[PDB]
Structure 1
Amino acid sequence: SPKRPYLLRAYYDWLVDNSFTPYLVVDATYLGVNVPVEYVKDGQIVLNLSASATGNLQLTNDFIQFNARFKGVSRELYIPMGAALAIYARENGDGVMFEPEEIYDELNIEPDTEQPTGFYE
Structure 2
Amino acid sequence: QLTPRRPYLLRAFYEWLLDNQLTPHLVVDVTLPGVQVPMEYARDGQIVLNIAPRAVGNLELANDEVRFNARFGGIPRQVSVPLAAVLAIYARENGAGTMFEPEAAYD
TM-score range, shorter chain: over 0.9
Q: 1:65-84 CA deviation, whole Å, 9 max, x = no partner? A: 00021121111000000000
C-alpha separation in 1, matches of 2:63 and 2:91: 21
The 8 Å contact of residues 38 and 77 in structure 2, kept in 1 or not, is answered as: no
Is 1:30 aligned with 2:32? yes
Higher relative contact order (CA 8 A, sep 6+): 2
Equivalent of 1:89, from 71, 91, 94? 91
Runs (4+) of structure 1 exceeding 4 A deviation are none
Q: TM-score, normalised by structure 1?
A: 0.84
More helix by share: 2
C-alpha separation in 2, matches of 1:69 and 1:94: 26
Equivalent of 2:54, from 34, 52, 55? 52
Is 1:9 aligned with 2:18? no
Structure number with larger C-alpha Rg:
1
Structure 1, gaps ≥5 residues long? 106-121
Aligned residue-pair number: 105
- Alignment identity in percent? 63
